[PDB]
Amino acid sequence: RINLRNTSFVTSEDLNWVKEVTRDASILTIPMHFWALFYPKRAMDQARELVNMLEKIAGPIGMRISPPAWVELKDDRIETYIRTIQSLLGVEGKIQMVVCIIMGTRDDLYGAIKKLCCVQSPVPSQVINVRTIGQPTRLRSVAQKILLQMNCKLGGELWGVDIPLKQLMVIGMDVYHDPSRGMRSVVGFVASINLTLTKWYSRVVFQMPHQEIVDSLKLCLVGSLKKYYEVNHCLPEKIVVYRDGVSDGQLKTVANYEIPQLQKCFEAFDNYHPKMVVFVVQHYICVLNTANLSPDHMQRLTFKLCHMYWNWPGTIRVPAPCKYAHKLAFLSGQILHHEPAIQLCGNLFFL
RNA sequence: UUACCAUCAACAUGGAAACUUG
RNA sequence: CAAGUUUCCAUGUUGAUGGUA
């Protein structure tokens, strides 16, 4: 099911392995040097153990891991971070990541850091909490998962899957109705860029009512198709949409209203009419069947696409391409409330 | 906001019915 | 025609508790 470099990956019994695994390579390992690490005053030797363990055994990933740019924090105050946390673009401007260990689990620290790491300075980064990783005897797996998160976050990937259906791009989305104030109804969008589902293009859509979302949807979809033609030069032919986040009550007013002028985006250019699949997820029922093939071959396709969560390798509840946009939705429509940046939409910087 | 698996507390919307006002 | 005192709940989110890790 799962592959790797120079070998296939392990498929266990209940497909959960977790305990000190990935003793082997990955798809891409760019050599990480300029990942400026910030440690606070209250976890000095803990962060020393973190760096020393990241250099040593975490499985032969192939990550050419090197000593980082070590930064030491005075305290955890607001003025301490907010002086220079733009993910450290002050002097050189040639950075990749900034890694921070934070003690106070105050959510506004996340809000400011991820806002000026997404839109004010578009940079992927990972934060570390002391109260979950601060002890040894479990350091192996959390160090491994930090390395795998960096692997996904540097524009590299962990694995892929074979696809028996030719030239397939996976369209997935998830609505986030805001329960607090404003009723944003933020809908994400994911699509595959490469043939083996390794590079992913993922947009975020921002619109106040439920009516003029469709224009931004069509703009994002023609941008995605232009990017697909740029990166592939042979146009995709299979289109499957995994719709989730709509109950039985909203099904009639959405599955018969939104999707026809979502389909109408294909009149921006000529010579195009591929096969369309739109499902529901709650259990799987289709609401648009244009591919006209057997249910078993595409139910197997959906069961395969359930299995590629690139931070949690294992079983999940709904299909994964729902959740790359779902976690993007509580990244943006809950925390950020800002339009996404151009470059990282080709990566999974939401994870 | 890690790496999900459960639980409960704090809350936001909706269903089912007694008191009672304009 | 609706506001309340509301009793049960359901639908979801935030923290914490135990963890696998």
Domain ranges of chain A: 35-153, 168-346
Angstrom resolution of this structure = 3.9
Q: Which CATH superfamily is domain A168-346 in?
A: Ribonuclease H-like superfamily/Ribonuclease H (3.30.420.10)
CB-to-strand C contacts below 7 angstroms: A 18-20, 105, 107, 132, 138, 140-142, 179, 330, 334
Q: Read off the amino acid at residue A293.
A: L
Distance A183 CA to C6 C1' (A): 28
What CA–CA distance (Å, rounded) separates A131 from A98? 20
The conformation of residue A20, written as its DSSP 8-state character, comes to: T
**CATH topology agreement for domains A35-153 and A168-346:** no
At the topology level, CATH places domain A35-153 in Rossmann fold (3.40.50)
* Distance (Å, whole) CA A89 – CA A84: 8
Side by side, which strands form the sheet with A238-244? Answer: A200-205, A186-192, A168-176, A238-244, A275-281, A284-289
- In angstroms, the CA of A302 and the C1' of C15 are apart by 35
The two three-digit tokens of residue A194, written as one number: 């490469």
Task: Please measure the distance between the N-terminal and C-terminal CA atoms of chain A and give it in whole angstroms.
Answer: 22
| C1' of C3 to CA of A206 (Å) | 36
A250 touches strand B (CB under 7 A): no
Instruction: Give me the residue label for tokens 């003793």.
Output: A23
Closest nucleotide to A142: CA versus each C1': B3
- A289 bridge partner residues: A277
Please return the burial class of A162, using the count of CB atoms within 10 Å of its CB with bins 0-12, 13-18 and 19+: exposed
* A28-44 b/e (C-beta count within 10 Å ≥ 16 → b): ebeebeebbbbbbebbe
Inter-residue contact A198 to A27 (CB < 8 Å): yes
How far is residue A204's CA from residue A41's CA, in Å, rounded to a whole number? 37
- The experimental method behind these coordinates is cryo-EM
Q: Where are the beta strands (DSSP E) in A1-63?
A: 35-39
